[PDB]
Symmetry: D2
Subunit: 74 residues, 4 copies
């Protein structure tokens, strides 16, 4: 639900995209549900909360959107 949980999952988002290349929003969400330690949560995060976070990272120069719907790491 909150930015701290999103902040804590940033490394897994980066690792994921680094290992597999560009991924779609829903796939990133599902993968986080299993890779981010349960204690840090993530289980309460919704896809729209994730989408907003990813777009913010894209806005900075950390991630590159990429037409059609996927996010790639810069």
């Amino acid at each position: 639900k909150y930015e701290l949980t999103l902040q804590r999952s940033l490394p897994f988002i980066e690792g994921m995209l680094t290992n597999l290349g560009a991924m779609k929003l829903h796939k990133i969400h599902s993968f986080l549900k299993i890779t981010v330690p349960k204690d840090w949560g993530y289980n309460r995060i919704t896809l729209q909360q994730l989408e907003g976070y990813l777009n913010t990272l894209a806005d900075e120069g950390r991630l590159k959107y990429i037409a059609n719907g996927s996010y790639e790491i810069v």
Copy 2:
């Protein structure tokens, strides 16, 4: 390179598709490279050997191809 390696990685292919939903051939390949324990190999498997194996699973009723290029678990 061989079917025993592919046979040994069937569970990770299933788990992957179960956790993330339908996936494209190249993403499944990339993911297997990191998730299948190195000792069982997989590192030697080419994408055409994987594609042939996934189609065999789809031919049986284990997987569902799905137009445009993705495999989903049944």
Copy 3:
């Protein structure tokens, strides 16, 4: 709770032990809880069901107990 679930998780027990070396019962149990896809369960398995299953694998020649309490893969 059942052997089919344990049977389905055998590949993850093997991989885990292959990647990390000999492990203690409780660590194997905790790791299975997060690595075995939730849809196959495992969440219902108790540590005494796991222990009985591992000892059976040890009785065959698939696993090696190893004094003090850890199981190593053969």
Copy 4:
């Protein structure tokens, strides 16, 4: 080989200890080998470099050593 790589693997070290509880040096090392994305390395890190890093974290108050040889997260 360097601290930048160890710095990048801190989140995985934390996650690991969070999901599994206290772990021994060698197990932490083996786990990082498979979990830290290959591109960030880690493959070049030796166990004495890891031990030095973990002891520095323990020194600060980020990790708790714990007699007999394991590291727990604080």
